[PDB]
Amino acid sequence: SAKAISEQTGKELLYKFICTTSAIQNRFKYARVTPDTDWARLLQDHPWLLSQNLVVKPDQLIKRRGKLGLVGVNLTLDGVKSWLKPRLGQEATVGKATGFLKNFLIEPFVPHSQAEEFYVCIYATREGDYVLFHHEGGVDVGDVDAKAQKLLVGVDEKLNPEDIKKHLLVHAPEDKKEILASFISGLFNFYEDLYFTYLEINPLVVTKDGVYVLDLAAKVDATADYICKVKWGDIEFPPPFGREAYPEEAYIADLDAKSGASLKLTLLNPKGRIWTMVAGGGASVVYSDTICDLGGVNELANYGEYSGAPSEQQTYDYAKTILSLMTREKHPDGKILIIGGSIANFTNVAATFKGIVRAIRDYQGPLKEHEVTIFVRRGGPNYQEGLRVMGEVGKTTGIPIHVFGTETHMTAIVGMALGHRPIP
Amino acid sequence: GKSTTLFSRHTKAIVWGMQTRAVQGMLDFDYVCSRDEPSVAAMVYPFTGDHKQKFYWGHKEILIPVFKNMADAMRKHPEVDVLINFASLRSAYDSTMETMNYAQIRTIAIIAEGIPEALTRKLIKKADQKGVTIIGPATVGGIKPGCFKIGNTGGMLDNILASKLYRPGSVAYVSRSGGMSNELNNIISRTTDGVYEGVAIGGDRYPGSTFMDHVLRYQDTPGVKMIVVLGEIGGTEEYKICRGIKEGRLTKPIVCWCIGTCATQASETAVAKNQALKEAGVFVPRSFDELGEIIQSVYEDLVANGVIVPAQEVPPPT
């Protein structure tokens, strides 16, 4: 899928790889600041921080930074340090999202007029890539999708420089059409070469001195790694602005990275009494839907899946993470584990269930202490053997474990688990 | 122009890749369907020289040729009109593009997950130009009971038998997931006369073929008496179904449920889609939990009105 990259990542790639006759100013003049930054070392590595005034802003995939007052503009290095004191390491809220401001970018301030601010954007659709231009960019740009000139570059077609001039740039200052045209041509070749699916620059600034990339947001098609790795390097794909990942979420992501199997875990409410461990992408969505539909949204602890034929060891490692997570605190009403899924096409149900069984066995004591009840519904290769050892580990440990086959409607166990219907 | 009928009991396919377990799965399916002949005519694999591979057609032993060059395969098997492409994600683009230089091939299933979106747009562009139907990428494929099964679709014979996918029923379906495809096989076989055809279009951003592509085929296939679509939050594909019904292009009973109701643009939510389809006269259940019930309900009405006449169960061969 397409994944966002940081502004600094996007700018670095652009400065490194764009090919344009138009002169791009302040190339590579950026410094990254975190709460662990050694400021004497940073100054020695970016002496340019003393040569002129600066701009500082968070680089954490937050939009509308300027208009929401998250940008410190035209400051001295000390003024940047001052502006950072009450913000860096502190919580901030943007829309319905809250998180710590912990990653900032410092760049040189660029004196310019509003008339020197422009808007450019490129983005992917099934029918090709749209290129957008507007002659009035910036925080004040407004509903740019309604206003911008737009041009579709069709699949396997070329962006014609004459179209850029005769259609995209019709409203641009006549003395800037040439530099703007060269830049956009270059930007598009770069967009295509590095497998971007979204690339926005707002404002793009052009003065007598040349072109400045003041603000950048972007996504690339992450599946293109095998093509672009030579240019991308160790590209990082940051999560949305919000809370930090839990250690267990990071562990599962690392599990995921190490195989063709899909292993995903996101905690919604770590104290919720309803935990799931579902096989199948669609299935995991449907079980969550079902739980919410039946009034359980506030007790829904997690969502995720284990898919694509994971091995017994992988399922063991996934399961033991869930079992640890659900035995941190007691709930007055005990807890529920939904082990569900559709009917697999190639996952070895016997192999994966053996993994879960091993995990249940290692956590049996706390599972009894936490009054965990387990419901299981699953089909696929060797599923009969899987359901057997699962029922069996219930008897052996004294943990209540109700197992069902394809005769039971996939979501039926949710109602059983919540006491909305009887257990057959 | 694109075909209405992709497969039949006479379909012959070429399989690209070294996938002997999948090929044997297809032949076991073919045998239990009482096909006259194996559905796989040949294989193509550029990483080895020509040769033959041993398979079983019932209790009999047979050899399937494996070609190094696709052209040899096409030319020696002019009867083949389906290619199933098991190429890895690094090989999937070129091999699919090359396949479409041979006009006998009307349908391509592309299995691999992880093909860059911009390469898939080029596959789509060429396919639409050539009149070729693409199922996938990132899909297990699809299945047409009694006729043809794509690669691993429908699991083991155990599953093929339990859900009676060895003979046709009257219900067609489309979904993104093959995970959910198998569940649909199961739900449909317990509540109706069974699946007529099922397709999984795959999970990529730009599928080679869309929900509406297949619903149209189903609409134009006499054997299909009702249609089931398992939709999903995101994009506006399902609205094309609404318009089709309102415009009178789509007339057969359609059941649809969009998953993702609990994900908490506005028209792209499962909630909104479910509600709009319902107002358009699509049979939409209160929730997935009632999907089987409503399918069964629509089916029983079609049986009462003589629209569906349930064939008689004949046991399958060995």
Which H or E run includes A395? Answer: helix A383-397
Beta-bridge partners for B163:
none
CA distances B135 to B26, B107, B120, B139, Å, are 17, 8, 12, 8
Residue pointed to by tokens 């410092």: A106
For CA atoms A186, A189, A194, A197, the dihedral sign is positive
Contact present, B211 and B241 (Cβ < 8 Å): yes
For A95, counting Cβ atoms within 10 Å of its Cβ (0-12 exposed, 13-18 middle, 19+ buried), the class is: exposed
The CATH-assigned architecture of domain A242-424 is 3-Layer(aba) Sandwich (3.40)
State the smallest CA–CA distance between residue B307 and chain A in angstroms: 27
What six digits make up the tokens of A277? 């461990």
E-strand ranges in chain B read: 13-16, 40-44, 51-57, 60-67, 82-85, 107-110, 133-135, 142-144, 148-149, 171-175, 195-200, 226-232, 254-259
**Based on C-alpha coordinates, what's the Rg of chain A?**
27
Q: Closest to A411 (Cβ–Cβ): which among B124, B206, B288?
A: B288
Residues in B closer than 8 angstroms to A1, CB to CB, are 205
Contacts of A2 (CB under 8 A, 6+ apart): A124, A197, A198, A219, A220, A221, A222, B117, B205
Amino acid in the structure at residue B104:
Q
The yes-or-no answer to whether A1-29+110-241 and A242-424 have a common fold is no
**SS3 (DSSP) at A382:** coil
Q: Closest to A126 (Cβ–Cβ): which among B185, B203, B206?
A: B206
- What order do you get walking across the sheet with A401-404 strand by strand? A274-276, A335-339, A372-377, A401-404
Q: Closest to B179 (Cβ–Cβ): which among A128, A226, A281?
A: A281
Dist CA A200 CA A148 (whole Å): 13
Residue pointed to by tokens 């506030």: A298
What six digits make up the tokens of B274? 């479910």
Question: Comparing C-alpha atoms, which of A93, A107, A92 is closest to residue A27?
Answer: A107
The yes-or-no answer to whether B1-138 and B139-318 have a common fold is yes
Contacts of A158 (CB under 8 A, 6+ apart): none
E-strand ranges in A271-359 read: 274-276, 302-307, 335-339
**Could you state, in order of their start, the residue ranges of all structural domains in chain A?**
1-29+110-241, 30-109, 242-424
Burial call B212-242: b when 16+ CB within 10 Å, e when fewer: bbbbbbbbebeebbbbbbbbbbbeebbbbbb
Beta-bridge partners for A211:
A24, A206
What six digits make up the tokens of A88? 């860096």
- Listing DSSP states for B86-146 in one string gives ---TTTHHHHHHHHTTSTT--EEEE--S---HHHHHHHHHHHHHHT-EEE-SS---EEETT
Dist CA B53 CA B64 (whole Å): 5
Tell me which CATH homologous superfamily contains domain A30-109: ATP-grasp fold, A domain (3.30.1490.20)
**Based on C-alpha coordinates, what's the Rg of chain B?**
19
Residues in B closer than 8 angstroms to A409, CB to CB, are 187, 289, 292
**Could you state, in order of their start, the residue ranges of all structural domains in chain B?**
1-138, 139-318
Dist CA B294 CA B255 (whole Å): 8
Amino acid in the structure at residue A65:
R
Beta-bridge partners for A263:
A306
Contacts of A8 (CB under 8 A, 6+ apart): A30, A32, A59, A105
- Residue B145: asked if its preceding bond is cis (omega within 30°), the reply is no
B253 is in an annotated binding site: no
Residue of B nearest to A157 (CA): B122
Dist CA A347 CA B137 (whole Å): 19
Contacts of B157 (CB under 8 A, 6+ apart): B28, B29, B32
Contacts of B198 (CB under 8 A, 6+ apart): B142, B143, B144, B153, B172, B173, B174, B175, B181, B184, B185
Asked if A381's CB is within 8 angstroms of B155's CB, the reply is: yes
A189 is in an annotated binding site: no
B222 is in an annotated binding site: no
State the smallest CA–CA distance between residue B247 and chain A in angstroms: 25
State the smallest CA–CA distance between residue B117 and chain A in angstroms: 7
The CATH-assigned architecture of domain B1-138 is 3-Layer(aba) Sandwich (3.40)
Give, in degrees to the nearest 5, the angle at Cα A198 between A196 and A203.
Answer: 120
What six digits make up the tokens of A286? 């449907």
Helix axes A7-17, A177-193, angle to 10 degrees: 110
Residues in A closer than 8 angstroms to B179, CB to CB, are 279-283, 307, 341-342, 344-345
For B53, counting Cβ atoms within 10 Å of its Cβ (0-12 exposed, 13-18 middle, 19+ buried), the class is: middle
Pick the residue of A294, A302, A345 with the most B CBs within 10 A to test the interface with B by mutation. Answer: A345
Contact present, A274 and A331 (Cβ < 8 Å): no
- Residue B137: asked if its preceding bond is cis (omega within 30°), the reply is yes
What six digits make up the tokens of A276? 């799931």
Q: Closest to B118 (Cβ–Cβ): which among A195, A293, A414?
A: A195
Residues in B closer than 8 angstroms to A411, CB to CB, are 287-289
B238 is in an annotated binding site: no
Pick the residue of A96, A285, A303 with the most B CBs within 10 A to test the interface with B by mutation. Answer: A285
What fold is seen in the domain A1-29+110-241? D-amino Acid Aminotransferase; Chain A, domain 1 (3.30.470)
Residue of B nearest to A300 (CA): B262
B280 is in an annotated binding site: yes
Does domain B139-318 fall into CATH 3.40.50.300? no
